[PDB]
Design a protein around this ligand. Sequence first.
Ligand code: HEM
Ligand code: HEM
Ligand code: HEM
Ligand code: HEM
Lengths: 146, 146, 141, 141
Amino acid sequence: MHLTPEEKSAVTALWGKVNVDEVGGEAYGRLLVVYPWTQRFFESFGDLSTPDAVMGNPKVKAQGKKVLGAFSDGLAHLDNLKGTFATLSELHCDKLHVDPENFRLLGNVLVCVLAHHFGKEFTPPVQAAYQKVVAGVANALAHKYH
Amino acid sequence: MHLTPEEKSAVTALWGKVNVDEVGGEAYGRLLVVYPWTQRFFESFGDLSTPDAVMGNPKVKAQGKKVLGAFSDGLAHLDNLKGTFATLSELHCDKLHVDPENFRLLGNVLVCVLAHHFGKEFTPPVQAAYQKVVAGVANALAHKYH
Amino acid sequence: MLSPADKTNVKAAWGKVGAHAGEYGAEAYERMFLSFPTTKTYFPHFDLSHGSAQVKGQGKKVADALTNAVAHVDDMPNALSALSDLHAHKLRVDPVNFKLLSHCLLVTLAAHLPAEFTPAVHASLDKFLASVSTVLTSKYR
Amino acid sequence: MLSPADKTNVKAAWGKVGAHAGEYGAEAYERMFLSFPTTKTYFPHFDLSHGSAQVKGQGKKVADALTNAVAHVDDMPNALSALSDLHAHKLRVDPVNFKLLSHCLLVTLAAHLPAEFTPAVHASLDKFLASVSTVLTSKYR
Ligand code: HEM
Ligand code: HEM
Ligand code: HEM
Ligand code: HEM
C-alpha cells in the first residue's frame, strides 16, 4: 500500500468534513442490514429484527462510533498502518474470532456511505484513494491472524 | 517472503522430485479444462474443445513447461519474489493483458496436481507451505499492474 | 433469491434513475477502471480517457440490459439469455470482476440518489446486482 | 448447471470414496485450517490439533451431507434445506469460506483417488461443490 501526495491530501481533506460518530453508526448499521451474517457477533445487542430496528439500536450505534474512531485515528498514520493496528489485529483474531472478510465488507459499506453523504464531491479519483485506504486498513487488521 | 524453516524445507524437498515439464503440462492443461474462460488468451493454440484435446495439445504442454520453468526459478529466490518477477509482471500487464485472478486459479490447480502426483506424501502441512508460495508468486506477478 | 419487497425496491430506485441510466452506467465503468485497475485488462482496445465515446457507449448498453432485467425481474435467465451466452463464450470475463462493477454501480447510485438510497434499498440493489451477475456467469462451464 | 455427464462423473467418483467419506471430510477440514488460518475463527470451541475427534466428527457430518446431496442431485435445495437454514440463520459462515473448503475437498480427493481424478472428473467435481455451496448460502439474505 502506497498513496501519492495527491491521494493523501484528498483523503484528509474529505475526512475533515466527516461527523465520525454519525458516519460510524450509519456504516455499521448498514453493514448489519446489507450483510446480515455479520450479526453473529452481536446477539447481546437486542432487537435487530428489521432495518429500522438495526439502524435505531443504541448498541449498534455505540459499536460504530468505537470502530470508526479507531479508523479515524489510523488516518494520521497512513505510512505505518501495520504498526498502528497490530494490537487490534491480535485481539480480533485471538479473542473476538472475527473472520477478516468482515473488514472488507465494512470497507465497501463505508465507501458507499461516503458517496451517499458527499454526492458529487466523492469523485472517481477520490473514491480510488479511499478504496486503497480501506483495503490497507483491512490488510493491517488481518496481519496478525494465525 | 517469510517462511518458517519448516515451510521452506517442505517446499524445497518436494520440488527436488518434480519433473517440471510433466507437471507443468498437466497443470496448465487442467487450468484450461476446469476454468474454460481462461482459454481466451490461447485462441491460436489449436483444438481445445474437449478434455482429451486440451491435455494432448502440444502447444498447451509447451506453454505449461515455459511457465513452470519460470515458477521454478522463483523458488530459488523466495526472499525476493517481487524483484524476481518484476519484468514478467510488466509483460503480463502491458503486452499480454492477463487479469491477475488467472494467477490465483493456476496456483490452486497446481496444488491439486501436486496432490494427485504425490498422494499421501503431500500432507496437510506440506500443502499449507505450497499455498503460501503460490499466493506469494501470484502477488509478485500482479505487483506492476497499473 | 429476490423477495417481493426486493423487487419493489429495485423497481422504485431504477425508475428514479430514469433517463440518466446510460450516464450512470458510464460513470460506474470509469469508477471501476480507476479503483480496480486490473479490470482495464479487458479493454485494451478502448480509448479509456474520461468521456470517450467508447466508454459512453458501453455505459448505455449496460444500462439498457439492466433496465430489461428490472422489467423482467421474475424471468431474468430468459431475458438475459443472449448476454449470458456472449459473456460465457466470447468475452470470458473472470467472474470476480462482476463484483467489482456491481460495487461501483452501487457507489454511483448512492452519489446520485441521496433521498432513495436507504439501508433497505441498498440491501435490495446489492442482492439484485448479485443475481444479475449470477445469471451472466451461469453458462461459463 | 450440472449436465448428465457431470452427474455421472460425480456419482462414480463419490461411489469410490465409499466408506472413507468421513475420513476424507476430516482431512479436508484439517487441510483448510492449516492452509487458510482465518477459517479457524468459526471453531474457537474446537481442539484443532491433528487427530482431533471434534474435527473427525465435523468431517463425518459434512461427508454424510454430501452423500445425501449426491443421491438427490436433481433435488438439492429440498434435500439440503435444513442445512441451508442452519448456515444462514445460526452459524453465519461468510460465503467466501465455502470456496476454501471446496478446494481442500478437491485436494483430498486427488491425494486419495489417483486413477479416478481425471481432468474431466476434476471439472465435474468442482462444478458440483460450487452448486452445493450455492444451495447452502441461498437463504443468507
Ligand atoms: C475498520 C475496521 C474495524 C476497526 C478499526 C475495529 C476496531 C475495534 C475496536 C477499537 C474495538 C474495541 C476494542 C477494545 O475493547 O479495546 C473493537 C471491538 C470489536 N470489534 Fe472490531 N473493528 C473493525 C471492524 C470490525 C468488524 C467488521 C466486526 C464484525 C463484523 C468487528 C467486531 C468487533 C467486536 C465483536 C468487538 C467487541 C465488542 C464488545 O465487546 O463490545 N470489528 N473493534
Ligand atoms: C505462475 C504464474 C505464471 C508465470 C511464472 C508465467 C510466465 C510466463 C512466461 C515465462 C512466459 C513466456 C514469455 C516470453 O515470451 O518471454 C509467459 C507467457 C504467457 N503467459 Fe504467463 N505465466 C504465468 C501464468 C499465466 C497465466 C495463468 C496465464 C493465463 C491463463 C498466462 C498467460 C500468458 C500468455 C497468454 C503468454 C504468451 C504465450 C504466447 O507466446 O503465445 N500466464 N508466461
Ligand atoms: C452488470 C454486469 C454486466 C452487464 C449487464 C454487461 C452487459 C454488457 C453488454 C450489454 C454488452 C454489449 C454487447 C453488444 O455489443 O451488443 C457488454 C459487452 C462487454 N462487456 Fe459486459 N456487462 C457486465 C459486466 C462486465 C464486466 C464486469 C466486464 C469486465 C470487467 C465486462 C466486459 C465487457 C466487454 C469487454 C464487452 C465488449 C465491449 C466491446 O468490445 O464493445 N462486462 N456487456
Ligand atoms: C460443503 C460445505 C458444507 C457442508 C455440506 C456443511 C454441513 C454441515 C453439517 C451437516 C453440520 C452439522 C449440523 C448439525 O449439527 O446437524 C455443519 C456444522 C457446522 N459447519 Fe458446515 N458445512 C459446510 C461448510 C462449512 C464451512 C466452509 C464452514 C466454516 C469454515 C462450516 C462451519 C460449520 C460450523 C462452525 C458448524 C457447527 C459445528 C459445531 O459446533 O458442532 N461449514 N455443517
